[model samples]
Target: LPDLKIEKLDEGVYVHTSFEEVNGWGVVPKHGLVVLVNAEAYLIDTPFTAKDTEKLVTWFVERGYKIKGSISSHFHSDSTGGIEWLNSRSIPTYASELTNELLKKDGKVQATNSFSGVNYWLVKNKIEVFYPGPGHTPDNVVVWLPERKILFGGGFIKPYGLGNLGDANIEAWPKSAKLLKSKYGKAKLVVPSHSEVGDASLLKLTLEQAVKGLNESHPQFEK
Candidate 1:
């Protein structure tokens, strides 16, 4: 918890970032979020390490919020690294079916619950997750808290004009981002796995970057 940095983003939404050095992505600042829904704390993604994950859990426990469960954005360590730790506490983990397979095949900590393409929960409040095509990875899914207008883009979206596309689906990246634009177009805040958060325009910005990287024509968006 000492190494993790947390900040409040909205009424019941909070974002936390942890620094970890990786070869290709360099010193990456991994990000995850927590949303207080229906008196329960829902962890959108896990931090980089089990230690940091414990701190995250402790933070919520101290605040007296019953941690309902966690949602994995993808199969990557930054997203699922803390699965084992969460499981140790009997906290459930939810992820896309593909994500579950990919991680399981790689001998990683797989999630407890698997959903097909999309999954929605109305337990305390509405929380939705959809595999919006592919971008950062083939199994990437974006979590949308419609009521908060916050789209947790995970690794699918990067900071404005920063960071390499990291294992991106070069061909499908733009189209995938487009899916997010069309599906969650009303999202006011787009939270990336790393870097500063931005408005809905960030989705379009990601598409533009992917297009340029592939030397392909970019899509036209309204001004």
Candidate 2:
């Protein structure tokens, strides 16, 4: 079982972190968002596994919040691993059409609903999903809470160091990061899938790393 930690960021907005023992990386922590809006609790991404996901959901249930739905930022396990648990309870899960396709091709469970293009309103106007381009993965997206000025960057934006680049679009990562910064530059809080949550400068740091990766010719880029 992974270790789970929750921290309140704003009223009804919490960030959950789950830890897993990953090969080569030792213990790695994955972060996601729990947003309470309109008397409903929505998940931005799932924990690293079904059991952890259940624990998270149970936490919210114990707190008197109904799980309305969930949205996956990409096709990776850290983003959609708990989809099976959500499905078991008949909770709706969403992902980009491209993300679903990638999941299917990877032989993983796909999201229940799929949207197209750069912009999607996950919770009407409260939560917004935007696909800047292709960075961490072709389908990776960033979620924006416009009213709160919080940007959930998922794995697309790095906090301090570069993460897994196995499926990254190295050549386009910098451009995507730049686009993300441009779109959400005013974000007060920026949350990455891993590492500490920060401000809009996190977006800038991500862009810098993406450029570095592209220029340094990361192994993935040589592919």
Candidate 3:
């Protein structure tokens, strides 16, 4: 209500975000996350505004949270900045290779009018991001907190709606979802970047969404 809020879900993790109107209509949400383990706290995503991320960092400073890990959800300008900012501080960051390649591509940058280049951020280690592959963008990845069973699943997929499959690879996505379920499904807390966070978010729901998206339900889950 003041301007920003930090909800401490656990002793070491927190959610830092703001609200944005989707298509200028509803609150779509813009997030920058913080994961604190021991005295070190890790940040997972950045918002659309660099200023927002800066504010969030300061919010942590205000709360006595010592800076620790800083990384991005993916390569998008919004989700990658906080890490970029932290990169100057030499925070260790991680992500898949696919995102780096996409950032290095020529046209994606020319098209976005400078909103897309994240190489410096990566070089700075502030933009440490990786993709498992082919969703949201070619370079997509999920952040797994193995000990906590908490995963910061980036743009490899969103939990709401059919997704922008109109421009995405249909096949890679479902496979990734299955892999995620097998690997990180046990996550008690799962945060899907740029969308809703659900408890017990599963491969089944992803399969259902994919099926509905393809306009054909899988024989197994079909009614």
Candidate 4:
């Protein structure tokens, strides 16, 4: 269907993006990630539906790498919409225990492999999944590739002032952003869940936005 567009950001890193119809937001694009290493690929998130997931998997198949599994940064549908399709294909889904619990609360499908906290792989590639307190959601996480100096911020970091703070913890957001910057300040590339990807300054911009928004008392949760 080509519903998802794939852009190769680096030798082993690809960004997959698709647009969806959000209420009052019209049609807007969102992003996912595909990290390739040693003939194996890891999907960071999924497109918005089972049909789109098939398209995404086929794209990876044509590129010649066995898909190992997928990871969800949060429990949002935009992050886990294609999970049933991934599971149907027997691809294991990984997420934090908090993510799984929250998904259950939302009555959405839970990840198959839930980890307590941070999860890392140094066997072939340096992929680290870490939780920096809480920002957009209670279970939000970021994926860091230390070797590549790339940080996938998912829904936690936005592009400059794009104000779509879905289920954010206003009181906790600024602190969370600080934690992320402190941990991954040297990152070369920073990819958000939606919009343009940028360098490490995106994190700084997000931090500023958090401070501005929090001080202004923006809505913590929107209906």
Who wins the TM-score comparison?
2
For each candidate in the order shown, give its overall lDDT on alpha carbons: 0.81, 0.88, 0.56, 0.82
**Runs in model 3 lying further than 4 Å from the true structure:** 88-93, 106-132, 215-223
Off by over 4 Å in 2: 218-223
The C-alpha local distance difference test score for the whole of candidate 3 amounts to 0.56
Better-scoring candidate (lDDT), 2 or 4: 2
lDDT of 4 by residue, 1-223 (tens): 2357889998889898877876764667778888887778888888888888788887878878888888888889889998888888888888888989998998988888888755555223567888898888878999988778998998899645535566778789899989898899999999988657899999899898888878898112344
Poorly placed runs, candidate 1 (over 4 Å): 23-26, 122-125, 159-166, 216-223
lDDT of 1 by residue, 103-183 (tens): 988998788888884555624356888787877888999888878889899888853542445656788877877777888
Choose the strongest candidate by lDDT: 2
Considering only N, C-alpha and C atoms within 3 Å, which residue pairs clash in candidate 2? none
Better by TM-score, candidate 4 or 3: 4
Looking at model 1, report the run of 10 residues with the lowest lDDT sum. 214-223
| lDDT of each residue in 1-223, candidate 2, tens digit only | 3579889998879999887775654677788999999988999999878988999999888889999899999999989999989988899999999999999999988888989988999898899999999888988998999879999998898745566788999999988998988999999999988767899999999999999988988111233
List model 3 lDDT by residue over 38-100, tens digit each.
555667766555466668777776778766555555567656655555555555545444544
